[PDB]
Symmetry: C2
Subunit: 883 residues, 2 copies
């Protein structure tokens, strides 16, 4: 309520009483709809929207969008405060009490536990960063306000500050007028490091240490223990995105490296200031004397502090002073290498190794601990240690992704130019034999004179860029649409042949349901190749996509097949004695495998993680989980706690009756899904009309330029905007009804399954949440306003199934806020605006001094396109999910 | 409750580092010291000393360390308790009182506030006892303590803050507290400037915002102009070369390029974030046209040297265009200063940087006009306003540097010049000749000396400093202060030497009158200077003159010095008013009351009325820098008290002394000076007794500063000697005979003293300060030092003083109507240690001093005692 009157006061101070009154009326009508649920109100509301001027409608959509965002920040502040006035400690206590597990078991499993969070630039972040920062300032002011230690004048100053920050957010054009470059996406992603993650990681480790001491473990978490890691796809994932050129990958690698160098350099001078002790071992004494021998008695005027040669009285300052020299030259080199194509800085003057950096700091730690100064060592020096051993010389290791067909094109050009055949036409067997003979052979393959296409040269040049850059700046090479060992061996061959000194691991991505059903067989065949099993060194990573699985088949069928896939992949890896780490391509929306993280981890089959996890963070989720101190801490918290329990507390393994039951149920679910999304021939026609899917690309979120043949992100987006959520719940109705029809005691067995099998419980509960965010009257309005009089009953069929499915869900679970008002308003505005857009009549270097002049190149009516983009932004904000 | 918590914490760490035995000995010392500070039985003092004699050399070092660090913790405790007790309820009070009491209107307060300036100048005077490496640790400790003294602690946060405070105390105790080599002037300037890029830089905008809030609480919706110079910062670090030959010209170059590079770095770190904020699209036709101009010459390039915004910024967000140009010029200013400092030259084009103080300001001012015009005034009064005030307050070089030099050096230079020109000897010339010659050369157009002038190392020192001033930007400098200035010829000499060394923009010259003889005759000299029409016509109606406080109370009494200072200020204002010159007076105040220290608002109120008038300039002596800018709250309270006191002294004039009070204080001053010089100069054995009863000689062992007959000593160790022994002789000496003689001459003069203390602010402040100094004193300490270090012979001498002490104290009150335990322990340790002083890698404390002429553990223990006592009294010198 406070955010409303504040906002409306600013809106009145910027646009007059009349417009604020119109917004107020819209809120009242929307309130009567979300209250009495009379559909008449919707039309009663729509009328008020038709009269609105072209500029005024833009102001209205702006207003309800910004109020939605303010509601989000309010929610975060209230959650943080209500939580603070009162998990890791709880998880430890439960693991000790419930499962009789000892503290040293928790500590040992915790040391050998790894959580690899990889950030992606998938176009799901609706709000632009220019406005996101303002959101951060607003939640900062609100956090300082929701408190009871305000000193009057401080409250007044924070009031003026919050007012000017809201006014600043409203005075920015929220619409990206040009799509970002991949470099811009990488910048937006990495901004969360030098603001939250960089300082958040040491604090999190310290909290884990405190809990461990609350279990009786005086020992501390080893600094080199990889409890959490950060990887990135920004600038590396080039699947379907030709804008990710090789030069882009070079750009993001040199970029991240220069950011890291800058951070370390800013930290090191203060660290030198603190380490003012004089007691050290004989070891550190000898090393510091070594540095003081080649001390370079010079002016050293390029530094501000400590420009005089550091005396041996304070040896830690000697050693860390050398660390500072190598950090200054590492930063200077990375800066020149980035800006210009070259550097005169000697490589020996920098840090080239991941732990050439660590060695001196490790030595200082050993010294402090040996001389009795361990408390001092477990302070800034330990924080710095963990920062190094977590972020390294380049904050994130970069992943590369590419579809198999491009590798096949390359190899085909290679075999054709070598006059040995055509790799494409070759069977799988031939590919394996040839690739193996070339991998074990010593003769070069292609040459400088290979006829290459722009695509072929793209992939080859990416491998050359990988070869030219340091090895610790890269992660894994992920193959999209991977089906056979020949694709992996193809990437290994292309890597070695492009002279990649230290080749990075190859990892398959199984995302389509057909690939997940047959994935364990393929991975087993890959492990059958002795050369590959002997190079892989007992470690293998495989990616498991979630977006496209629930797109071609049902959501239920996709979830179940994902579970089976994980289980049998672990079975294969155990059969070959290989440590398997699985890479979960989870989204933000439940339709693409999203949901609460700990529920997603618990819903994984037991003994499939084993202290090694890898999860994607799709663009928008980055802000959701790292935009504030508290959010980031809750992130590392939820991940490590859920993983640790799933390691020591295995989820129940499904009873065989549950196996057969979910197999049949999955068959019925897939038939029910493809029945309405593929068998119905008019379905695509109805979809392109009842949802705002086509307009998604207008938001310019990402850098990426048949319903089966579309991306999963706008697929979930379309049914999310209309608040119908078809892909989330479709198959479940017919699945359940067929299971109770076949047998009546299967109702007792469904009740049995919901209360003991975590996978089933999590799935059903997610569906119930999605129903809590849905309203069929909205989709009904979109149909009535945009779907032709013809196939009106079609949607009604769906609407029937909608309610039909929901009644079943609660029947298994045993079951019988205010922001939805704004969401409804924006829904109506979107429907009417779409009706005016798909009309012929409203189809068409100066400055701009009003909203209508912000879109000069709009094919649609002056004020319409901006209003549409505003509606999509606002609805996505209210639902806290884009796609 | 706070001090006990710091104690048990510290003793727990000390036991964890050196065993139960040593902690028990510390406890015993605390108990004995408690019985002395309670019952005041002098026997206890000797009872304490015995326990100290048995102490091993290393054990004794650990003991002195222990009580010193406990004192420091007591200081931090005091600061946190003060901040919290103040926060859980001044500018608002000052405004409300100015409106209610004096009927003054808000717009008068706003106008006077706009035209008010307070110039705080930081000095590297060697009064900062604690080394910087340890001061930082103190900052971390007070941070932990502040976060602890609160009731919103989340259990695990309290435990982690416990670990942090424990490891930080252990870190401070594990550092060698003794500076083993004195710093360089550059190091002094660095220690001084560290308070900028940590507290002042972000403290100034917040302070201005608070002033805006108060003004709106008086009804003034208008805001303080961003270019209104309410506060400024100057520096002596690297410029004051009086008696310090280590301050070379290359040092001045170093500190100027240094400070400039610091400023550039700070602005560059701010500008990228400011660009992120200014995302509006509405602007005037003005900012539209300018942004289009920049976007024309936008340099469509990769621009990969920046991290953010490396693509050419589109005109849709014009503020980002303009601020982007600001960022380019800031990057090249920083690169230029960095190369100029590092090597000594730069390939960076000057046109690519900001060379003017307000070439920087112009684009930001444009952004402000735009935001205000388009209805976005709240947005402009945010980070952009903070940035504006930061620029218009700190400029391109955080502080304008003062240069100070004694007149005799300028005279040496001129004498070489006249001798080489075969026109006479400038030294032997009378004042008249100096004035006529200097004036003829100043108004002439012919060069003076040439390349072939025979110079001494001193002559080349001053001339080369002027050449360095010429080579460097003009806005990096402040004023040229002349020590021991007596005639206009001393000022004109510096004006001529400046012009002749091709100083394009010559800086203002300001005399420094510090000795009592110079203060008595200062108005006559300044009037003679204003009588010279050429100088009055170049000075442009503005003149600054410095008034030192250290040496005044050293040769004469403290009372006589204070009164003569008041008279001096008053008659200087009379002279300047008589010549239509705006006089701004430069107060060389110390930290200790003996050198003109004390509470700041009391020092400002105790100035004669109509002597500031919206223009004030006060020094901040080294130790006072940490005292007044070491934390956010400290810095804020500093700017608060300064601006509030000055504003009140402008609108609320202090009472002018009645004539009876003038004659009375003149007589009283005669008696006071006779009383002072009677015991500090007439007694020939006084120097002998002083060099034994005080640890004065050992002061230089602390290595605080870079500077290599009692009439002939520095005032700083003079106040230090009597402050350590807690006797405070220079503070109260003359007052006794003065008062007693005034009541002797007339009995109703008692009623007139009673009358004076309750109405005249100067007198009230003086007496109250003396009472504080008495509250920090104990004659039993001086008695112990005499008994232990003064020969059996002249023992009664000190007793005579011990008499006057109590007598004077009884007079003072008659007109006016916990840490000491540790301090006492350190006192006993210091006296006994001195008695042992007059008698004939490193892996433990004793090996920290390998080049000590004294016994292995003794010198370190002495330095530790001085440090600790100074910390406990919160004053060194």
């Amino acid at each position: 309520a406070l955010l409303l009157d504040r906002f409306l006061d600013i809106l009145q101070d910027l646009h007059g009483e009349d417009l604020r009154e119109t917004v107020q009326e819209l809120y009242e009508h929307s309130a009567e709809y979300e209250g009495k649920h009379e559909p008449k109100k919707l039309e009663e509301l729509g009328s008020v929207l038709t009269s609105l001027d072209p500029g005024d409608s833009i102001v209205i959509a702006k207003a309800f969008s910004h109020m939605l965002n303010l509601a989000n920040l309010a929610e975060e502040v209230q959650i943080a405060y209500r939580r603070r006035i009162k998990d890791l400690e709880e998880t430890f206590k439960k693991l000790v009490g419930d499962l009789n597990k000892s503290p040293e078991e928790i500590f040992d499993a915790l040391k050998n536990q790894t959580v690899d969070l990889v950030l992606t630039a998938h176009p799901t972040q609706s709000v632009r960063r220019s406005l996101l920062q303002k959101h951060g300032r607003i939640r900062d002011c609100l956090a300082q306000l929701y408190a009871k230690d305000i000193t009057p004048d401080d409250k007044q100053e924070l009031d003026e500050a919050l007012q000017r920050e809201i006014q600043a957010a409203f005075r920015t054009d929220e619409i990206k007028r040009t799509p970002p470059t991949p470099q811009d996406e990488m910048r937006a992603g990495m901004s969360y490091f030098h603001e939250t993650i960089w300082k958040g990681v040491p604090k999190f480790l310290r909290r884990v240490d405190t809990a461990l001491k609350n279990i009786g473990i005086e020992e501390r978490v080893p600094y080199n223990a990889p409890l959490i890691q950060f990887s990135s796809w920004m600038g590396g994932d080039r699947d379907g995105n030709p804008r990710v050129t090789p030069e882009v990958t070079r750009d993001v690698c040199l970029l991240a490296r220069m950011m890291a160098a800058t951070m370390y350099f800013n930290q090191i001078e203060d660290l030198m200031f603190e380490m003012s002790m004089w007691r050290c071992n004989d070891e550190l004494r000898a090393r510091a004397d070594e540095v003081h021998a080649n001390s370079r008695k010079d002016a050293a005027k390029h530094y501000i502090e400590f420009w005089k040669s550091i005396p041996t009285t304070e040896p830690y300052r000697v050693i860390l002073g050398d660390v500072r020299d190598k950090l200054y030259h590492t930063r200077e080199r990375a800066h020149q290498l980035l800006s210009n194509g070259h550097s005169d800085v000697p490589v020996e003057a920098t840090f080239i190794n991941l732990e050439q950096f660590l060695e001196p700091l490790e030595l200082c730690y050993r010294s402090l601990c040996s001389c009795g100064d361990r408390p001092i060592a477990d302070g800034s020096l330990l924080d710095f240690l963990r920062q190094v051993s977590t972020f390294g010389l380049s904050l994130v290791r970069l992943d590369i992704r590419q579809e198999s067909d491009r590798h096949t094109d390359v190899l085909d050009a290679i075999t054709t130019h070598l006059d040995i055949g055509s790799y494409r036409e070759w069977s799988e067997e031939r590919r394996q034999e040839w690739l193996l003979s070339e991998l074990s052979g010593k003769r070069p393959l292609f040459g400088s004179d290979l006829p290459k296409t722009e695509e072929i040269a793209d992939v080859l040049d990416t491998f050359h860029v990988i070869a030219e850059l340091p090895a610790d700046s890269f992660g894994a090479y992920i193959i999209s649409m991977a089906t056979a060992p020949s694709d992996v061996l193809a990437v290994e061959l292309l890597q070695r042949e492009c002279r990649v000194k230290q080749p990075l691991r190859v990892v398959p991505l199984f995302e389509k349901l057909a690939d997940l059903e047959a994935a364990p067989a393929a991975v087993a065949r890959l492990f059958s190749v002795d050369w590959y099993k002997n190079r892989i060194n007992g470690k293998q990573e495989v990616m498991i996509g979630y977006s496209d699985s629930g797109k071609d088949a049902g959501r239920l069928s996709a979830a179940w097949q994902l579970y089976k896939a994980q289980e049998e992949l672990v079975k294969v890896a155990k059969e070959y004695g290989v440590k398997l780490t699985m890479f979960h391509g989870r989204g933000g929306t439940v339709g693409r495998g999203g949901g609460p993280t700990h529920l997603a981890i618990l819903s994984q089959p037991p003994d499939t993680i084993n202290g090694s996890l890898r999860v994607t963070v799709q663009g928008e989720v980055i802000e959701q989980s790292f935009g504030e101190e508290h959010l980031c801490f809750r992130t590392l918290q939820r991940f490590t706690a859920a993983t640790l329990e799933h390691g020591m507390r295995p989820p129940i393994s499904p009873k065989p009756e549950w196996r057969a039951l979910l197999d049949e149920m999955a068959v019925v679910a897939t038939e029910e899904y493809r029945s309405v999304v593929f068998q119905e021939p008019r379905f695509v026609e109805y979809f392109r009309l009842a949802t705002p899917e086509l307009e998604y690309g207008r938001m310019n979120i990402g850098s990426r330029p048949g319903i089966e043949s579309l991306r999963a992100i706008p697929w979930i987006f379309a049914w999310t905007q209309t608040r119908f959520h078809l892909p989330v719940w479709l198959g479940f109705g017919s699945a359940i009804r067929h299971v109770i029809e076949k047998d009546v005691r299967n109702l007792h067995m469904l009740q049995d399954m919901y209360q003991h099998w975590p996978f089933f419980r999590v799935t059903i509960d997610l569906i119930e949440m999605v129903f809590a965010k849905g309203d069929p009257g909205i989709a009904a309005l979109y149909d009535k306003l945009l779907v032709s009089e013809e196939l009106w009953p079609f949607g009604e069929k769906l609407r029937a199934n909608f309610e039909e499915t929901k009644k079943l869900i609660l029947q298994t679970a045993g079951h019988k806020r205010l922001r939805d008002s704004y969401i409804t308003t924006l829904n109506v505005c979107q429907a009417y605006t779409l009706k005016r857009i798909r009309d012929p009549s409203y189809h068409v270097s100066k400055p701009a001094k009003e909203l209508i002049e912000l879109n000069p190149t709009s094919e649609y009516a002056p004020g319409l396109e901006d209003t549409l983009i505003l509606t999509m932004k606002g609805i996505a904000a209210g639902l806290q999910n884009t796609g």
